[PDB]
């Protein structure tokens with residue numbers, strides 16, 4: 001049955017358009033006042049229908065050569081398990097990660113941290129060690145528009161007054177990068193290229209974009225394997241994973257410079273560039289190394305019709321890492337034919353996620369470049385959606401990125417594959433974490449000598465400093481369960 005796009009929060013299907021975004025993390029201090037205030041908040045929430053209407057209007061204005069308006073910033077809302085509990089909404093949503101919460105789950109994710117008995121505390125900024133009940137987030141074109149809309153929302157809940165119904169835990173801000181690199185993450189790689197197409201939503205999937213059933217993103221829609229276990233109010237909500245991911249840019253650049261791929265005919269500079277590309281799975285431009293393994297192709301990169309049409313063929317069963325290491329980030333996070341082809345012919349639609357990241361922080365300074373060391377915080381406000389954190393984000397992190405034997409272990413489960421004997425892909429070098437913070441390695445980066453590993457520097461390139469798992473309910477869920 002068609003999706004009710006008026007009922008779905010707009011960041012899930014569509015995505016809030018932005019140059020800047022604020023995430024406001026709160027605790028509920030007076031439940032019944034919160035629910036009364038929620039009634040006034042709900043009409044401000046951007047829906048998926050709204051996303052489409054707004055984007056068509058901006059396009060039409062541009063075609064008509066009308067000057068642009070100040071767009072109102074857009075707002076969405078999401079609640080943690082702790083917040084559901086505080087509100088007396090006690091239905092089990094059938095996601096172990098969400099229910100556990102990210103502060104405890106971060107031990108298994110591999111985050112740095114310490115233990116006192118069985119109690120793990122991740123090495124996070126202080127506010128993310130507190131119980132967080134929800135997030136209100138506001139996206140827009142400039143700081144003024146976001147701040148105006150956020151102040152209006154805060155006013156609804158009486159924030160900072162003696163009649164508040166919530167309190168600020170903390171807030172974080174994202175900002176796209178300057179100029180032509182605005183959609184490049186801070187390591188320099190174009191981000192946001194590959195997402196699953198969603199049946200009943202994406203009417204014209206791109207070449208190479210296999211569409212998946214909407215229930216892999218939205219609870220209780222077609223394809224949600226847990227639909228019968230979940231409460232009716234959960235229909236058309238999605239699980240929002242937030243990760244506050246600091247990046248160590250100069251350190252990564254130093255790594256690459258210190259480990260150029262030695263290949264006949266390449267200079268040190270070109271070998272270092274190729275290494276970066278091979279660790280990610282794309283050149284900085286976005287061109288996929290599977291299509292262009294020897295050198296960048298900026299024209300390919302810029303063409304959405306071509307830049308994602310690859311599946312890794314049968315390179316895994318052949319043991320062939322010449323075009324792309326097995327442990328490249330994109331391959332660790334969306335395996336394509338590594339799992340979907342023979343021997344497994346696996347259905348990994350439940351491993352798909354929709355990402356809505358935005359960068360944070362200033363550009364690398366001259367002193368940082370000279371020093372080859374980070375002096376300022378910068379990174380990614382990682383956000384992804386799916387109908388199961390257990391199947392998606394958590395699984396990806398623990399079972400794929402953190403698993404040095406993946407994807408060899410998965411395919412040799414089915415039968416012996418002699419070209420894979422002894423092959424140990426290693427960690428995803430962007431996000432892979434080793435519990436206890438020990439030695440990580442990555443193999444397959446030199447196309448001529450796949451067996452050689454690089455042992456990564458002990459400072460991980462990405463450092464998590466906070467996070468939580470939330471559920472973004474539908475508009476009718478908010479009206480009926482969250483409001484009076």
Ligand code: HEM
Pocket residue numbers: 185186187189190191192193194195243245246247280282329330331333334353379380382393396397430431462
């Ligand atoms: C600072 C941290 C991160 C950086 C710098 C980063 C960077 C990138 C880049 C450059 C791409 C390729 C272009 C694209 O398809 O968008 C990408 C793809 C992707 N990443 Fe990340 N990433 C980060 C964190 C994460 C995390 C934490 C996860 C999941 C646990 C994740 C999952 C994905 C997925 C699913 C894709 C798409 C793969 C595909 O469909 O080909 N990434 N990442």
